[PDB]
């Protein structure tokens, strides 16, 4: 186990389409799947999970190649990866729709599932990342404040395995810079927490898998250009940080082009890492949105 498991939750594995996925599961009731993003693992949800498990069956998988999950066998584009996550969720809720919460690249790896299987999704919560489309080609490389928040897209997508070659052996240093530069509350990350994430990402296949998601981003953009001809119909909420490192108003404004029924919130003073930076308000919003009318 790479991260401590909360009391009442089990750490387990399930093979989907030949790939062994890791997840942490607990609670009882309708299913909620929480999908982490880059620089993290299932563990970013560990404060939200015990609250949601009072009323829901909660599952938090590790993305293929990351955490303790095997790499995908098809590829790292959103449409390919979404297949694994959809089949995993259907294994635990084969007869009823489930809720989905996703963060950062969790969004990239679930959007194709959601739009293609809308009857399987009851509610949707998306936080802190763009859905891959041509809008991401407008984010600036460099800013009047210096280092931009998006330069890593091209760094990670570069050929010649640039990112692995430069970062290997220096995962702890790079991850601390990456996380803190995308944070407003930079000090919330204990030294041990950063050690645990770096240890997980320093596994050679996890370091590589990390960057393959970005090497597949242009293919994901092209996939979504076709998929987005169908708008999302289920109730949706977006969350974004209102501080340094966050998406700000972009999150809701983009989502309005993809979904009919969307509510959005910007958390002031919070950056990219909402579950850690602004745990109590974010947790409350998710629980509320998922609890409502039920």
């Amino acid at each position, epitope marked *: 186990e790479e991260f401590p498991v909360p009391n009442g939750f089990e750490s387990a594995y399930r093979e989907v389409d030949g790939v062994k996925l890791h997840y942490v599961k607990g609670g009882q009731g309708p299913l909620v799947m929480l999908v982490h993003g880059f620089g993290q693992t299932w563990y970013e949800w560990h404060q939200l999970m015990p609250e949601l498990a009072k009323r829901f069956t909660v599952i938090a998988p590790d993305l293929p190649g990351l955490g303790q999950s095997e790499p995908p066998k098809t590829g790292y584009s959103g449409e390919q990866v979404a297949v694994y996550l959809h089949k995993l969720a259907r294994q635990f809720s084969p007869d009823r729709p489930f809720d989905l919460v996703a963060h950062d690249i969790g969004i990239w790896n679930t959007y194709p599932m959601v739009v293609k299987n809308q009857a399987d999704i009851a509610r949707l919560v998306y936080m802190e990342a*763009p859905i891959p489309d041509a809008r991401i080609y*407008r*984010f*600036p490389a460099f*800013t*009047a*404040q*210096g*280092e*931009s*928040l*998006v330069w890593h897209f091209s760094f990670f997508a570069a050929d010649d395995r640039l990112a692995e070659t430069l970062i290997a052996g220096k995962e702890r240093f790079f991850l601390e810079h990456f996380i803190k*530069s995308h944070a*407003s*509350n*930079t000090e919330v990350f204990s030294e041990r927490l950063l050690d645990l994430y770096a240890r997980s990402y320093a596994k050679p296949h996890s370091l590589n898998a990390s960057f393959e998601y970005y090497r597949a981003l242009n293919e994901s953009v092209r996939q979504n250009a076709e998929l987005a001809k169908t708008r999302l119909q289920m109730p949706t909420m977006t969350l974004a940080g*209102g*501080g*340094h*490192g*966050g*998406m*700000g108003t*972009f999150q809701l404004e983009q989502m309005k082009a993809y979904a009919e029924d969307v509510e959005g919130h910007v958390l*002031p*003073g*919070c*950056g990219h890492w909402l579950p850690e930076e602004c745990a109590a308000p974010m947790n409350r919003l998710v629980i509320d949105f998922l609890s409502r009318g039920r």
Partner: nanobody, 124 residues
Framework: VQLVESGGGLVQAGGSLRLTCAAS????????MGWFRQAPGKEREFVAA???????????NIADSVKGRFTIFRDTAKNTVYLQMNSLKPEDTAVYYC?????????????????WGQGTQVTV
């Protein structure tokens, strides 16, 4: 958050100064930041604002009275805010203050989040 301004002084018309805004307690990394000024006799008024950095970039708004002469910018390594004042005029004489808000529009409307610091005197 406890705000500390510095960099003021006495300068001749056409001269230049750079003001610094820092937090002696807390952090304004998560908030838009702005400069305000107050001349003796007047109330405090908005000068310039700069947003936080988002994935889409950032935004600034500069009051028409100093547009083309003053610029505002941030250092995200120090978590500080600066006012670069070029082409100073006598009518720029005032005490200059920084404060924050959730967005630059709020600063443009005179709103702010924290207790005012001592300010810094600029005499032209």
């Amino acid at each position: 958050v406890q705000l500390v301004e510095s960099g003021g002084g006495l300068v001749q018309a056409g001269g230049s100064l750079r003001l610094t805004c820092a937090a002696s307690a807390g952090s304004f990394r998560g908030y838009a930041m702005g400069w305000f000024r107050q001349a003796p006799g007047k109330e405090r008024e908005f000068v310039a604002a700069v947003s936080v950095l988002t994935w889409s970039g950032d935004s600034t708004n500069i009051a028409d009275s100093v547009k083309g002469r003053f610029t505002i910018f941030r250092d995200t390594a120090k978590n500080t805010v600066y006012l670069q004042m070029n082409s100073l005029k006598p009518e720029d004489t005032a005490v200059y203050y920084c404060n924050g808000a959730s967005e630059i529009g709020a600063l443009q409307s005179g709103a702010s989040l924290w207790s005012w610091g001592q300010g810094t005197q600029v005499t032209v």
